[PDB]
Design a protein around this ligand. Structure first.
Ligand code: GHE
Ligand code: GHE
Ligand code: GHE
Ligand code: NAG
Ligand code: NAG
Ligand code: NAG
Ligand code: NAG
Ligand code: NAG
Ligand code: CA
Ligand code: CA
Ligand code: CA
Ligand code: CA
Ligand code: CA
Ligand code: CA
Ligand code: CA
Ligand code: CA
Ligand code: CA
Ligand code: CA
Lengths: 204, 204, 204, 204, 204
């Protein structure tokens, strides 16, 4: 339980080895959830932001940037993509929620809502995951791909087991987030593997 | 008669099956009319916003987006198109009126008037329609086309049997519309067919 | 003598038949003159705004839009073109003057002066004209061309037999023009031929 | 000695004949010098702004616009070019200085300094020149080229036999220039040859 | 020890000969360091800003502009590149730091931080350098390349043997920098070789 307030992870080079493991207890399958964080990268190609796999299931929960201005969400291998107008390169605050009952996934880029899309209505996201920043898993905790690796900075990451209202998403964007029960940036359990450096956050 | 204030329809995936039926009594043929609503979609291709058919007549009244920045109005199979400068993707408030006596159709995008165009002077729009959101009809209530389907969110839909003055169009754009006698968002009769979800409106 | 204050002509479709005839006494050949009006059209091709012909002389005085951002003035079949930065589609207030003694023609788009150009120094523009909005004449009052027709809205048209100073051109742009002695929008003699509708001006 | 305050030269058509001769005594070779003026033209091709030749020497001192956003200075046939961000077409206030001792030529477009460049260090610009607006000389006062001719308006022209500090360049840009000892717009000796008209300056 | 406050070096032409040697004692290998300066050039090709070589080691420390919007840092032949949105041509204030312990290099363009990148973790930058402005060294003080030469103006150069905090980088950008212990613009030891002129700084 480490307090990373005002710090970021820095993945300072393209690689197939550098990454961070996020550790959560969880154990109960996910029905609703909201995830959010800040990222800053000048990659033009595609990259994984947040990779969440479980035993036997690739891309169980994956936030993945297709290209400038397109964000994709995977839920149990099914995919959904939404577009937004953004500058490049630029810092972004990404936030994504998904609700099993309706299947709706809303993206929120820099406090602006993208078009809602739907997938996997009725599905339950599997538990006891391996979660990875800086690489995209194609196995249970490994088999990475260099050309999907993330190069840049990530911080202010939070994950709740519910769907945040707009009022609460704004709070997170403005740096005063509600306390999170799946991943909290101020009490984070993480392993660093490879070349990842922790530095102060100087771009918000 | 359901009050959808502050809610929207969400057509969360491309399909040939998802759609909403709007139900109005009407019965008397339409001479003048104003239609308006909000839409938010990141489709680059063409799509139907509002499809209104009658027994034996395709595209009797159809609002249809050709491509970014071009809105078309069909009246009795005749078509008229007007251009506007818009960002993309972005939420839009569309509003369109048509007057039989003059044949003039004015479009109003986000409270800005497009160039007036004319068609079907003297025509009477047929009554007892089937009205459909989220798909484009090529029959009396069906025979849809996937590549014309609407994917995104629609709300704040109103339809009057008269032509609104500018003062009243602004009112609708600003969220304080006059009460409507053909379709009112606050007392709406609708059927949902397929995958359509109702959610709160978070983008105005 | 009809007062069209706050109204516009609407040429609502492309055609070779719709047009308006403007009627002025004149009778004395034109030495100096200023013309101005508002127009709103989303045509990308070329079109005639103001066509003024006399017996035996085509394009005696013609204001003609070549393409987006280029305005041409014809004086006795001689042509002159000036460029400007404009958005599209957008409403414009055009104003053009010409002085025989110097041959100089200045264009003024939305109150901004274009580069001055010269032509026909010493020429006298012929009298007893047929003047036409919405079509381009290739005869004395007819032989139109569909692909030069104007589609959109025109209003606030004034024509003086002198050259307005800048102070007066601004006045016209801002909607408080000096009274005009060749064509006055507030006492206009006009015939409508074909499909032309008069509607209120809603875009200024 | 004519006062052209608030007036401009208008070169109203492309030609190989229209031009203005500027007349100065000078007689002593130029070591340092600053030149400046306003110009307004919608030509996309190359054109000469200011052409200064002497007996037996082409392009002794020549300010020449290569294309949109590139200004060239010739000093004794040697050339130097600097770039700037500008809108087009648009009025510009150009100002250029050159210092023999250092060879440095600074351009100042609309009160903004371009990158300094150098040429002809140690050179002395020849005296008893023929100076021409509106054409580019390839002889001592003539042998013009149509495709280098200037078409548009020029005014507020001043030339000093020293190098103005920044404070003084701003003054000239803002319309309150120091009195000039080589060419002064308020006491100018000029011949008009061909089609050149003097009109009031309406674009500053 | 010369005070260049409010002056710049001007490399006024492309060449393989013009350059400036910067002289520092140093002698102790560099572990951390921050470098910063202002530059103004309208070159579209690549150029070296700051070239620092040591006996037997090319590109030991090199700041090098790849193209518009891309800045590269070399540390012991290894390279790292970061992107930024900039206008062109435009004056820029560049500032770059590097820390051996972490290998992290941060760029700061006009007071804005680029994405951090990493290289040469653990490395020690060699001492007793030859440092050169206006050319890129491929030997110990020479063997230049014309097509990498810098053409424009450089000034306000400072270099510290530590890593400046953000607060101090802002100070340097705003013209009130902390005193520097490797290179100080207000006490600079430099040789000028070739065509380089010192002029006042007129573009900040
Ligand atoms: O990698 C993933 O888990 C998913 C998530 C988003 C990107 N992606 C893709 O599958 C896109 C390409 C993946 C791998 C790939 O391109 N190929 C191409 C040849 C073999 C290999 C594969 O599909 O297994
Ligand atoms: O579908 C409509 O009702 C109208 C309204 C806007 C688009 N549209 C069109 O007709 C354009 C194309 C429609 C369908 C189509 O393109 N084709 C082409 C082959 C079969 C099918 C048809 O003509 O029935
Ligand atoms: O119509 C006019 O009077 C002037 C006004 C501006 C354009 N224009 C033209 O004449 C351009 C071309 C007009 C007609 C045309 O293009 N052609 C091409 C072949 C037959 C026909 C003709 O010149 O008679
Ligand atoms: C998820 O949210 C829905 C909608 O509020 C709710 O009905 C359900 O009980 C929630 N499930 C869990 C596990 O929190
Ligand atoms: C439609 O509006 C026109 C005014 O142009 C009016 O004359 C007519 O009575 C109206 N008809 C209906 C059915 O509202
Ligand atoms: C036209 O304008 C010129 C320039 O002032 C003037 O000399 C002349 O008298 C005017 N003639 C007419 C008929 O307006
Ligand atoms: C030109 O300027 C230089 C430097 O400012 C000066 O030394 C010299 O006296 C000047 N010469 C003339 C003729 O103005
Ligand atoms: C380099 O910076 C690190 C981090 O602050 C510091 O521990 C070290 O003493 C510095 N080394 C030198 C030589 O300044
Ligand atoms: Ca995978
Ligand atoms: Ca993969
Ligand atoms: Ca149809
Ligand atoms: Ca269809
Ligand atoms: Ca004609
Ligand atoms: Ca014609
Ligand atoms: Ca020449
Ligand atoms: Ca020539
Ligand atoms: Ca080298
Ligand atoms: Ca080299």
């Amino acid at each position: 339980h480490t307090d990373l307030s005002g710090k970021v992870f820095v993945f300072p080079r393209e690689s197939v080895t550098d990454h961070v493991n996020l550790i959560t207890p969880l154990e109960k399958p996910l029905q609703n959830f909201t995830l959010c964080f800040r990222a800053y990268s000048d990659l033009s190609r595609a990259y994984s932001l947040f990779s969440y796999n479980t035993q036997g299931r690739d891309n169980e929960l994956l936030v993945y940037k297709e290209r400038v201005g397109e964000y994709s969400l995977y839920i149990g291998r099914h995919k959904v993509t939404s577009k937004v107008i953004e500058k490049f390169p630029a810092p972004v605050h990404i936030c994504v929620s998904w609700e099993s009952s309706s299947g709706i996934a809303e993206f929120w880029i820099n406090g602006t809502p993208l078009v809602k899309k739907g997938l996997r209505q009725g599905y339950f996201v599997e538990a006891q995951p391996k979660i990875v920043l800086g690489q995209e898993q194609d196995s249970y905790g490994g088999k990475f791909d260099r050309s999907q690796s993330f190069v840049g900075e990530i911080g202010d990451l939070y994950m709740w087991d519910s769907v945040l209202p707009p009022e609460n998403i704004l709070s997170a964007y403005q740096g005063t987030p509600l306390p999170a029960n799946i991943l909290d940036w101020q009490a984070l359990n993480y392993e660093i593997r490879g070349y990842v450096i922790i530095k102060p956050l100087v771009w918000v």
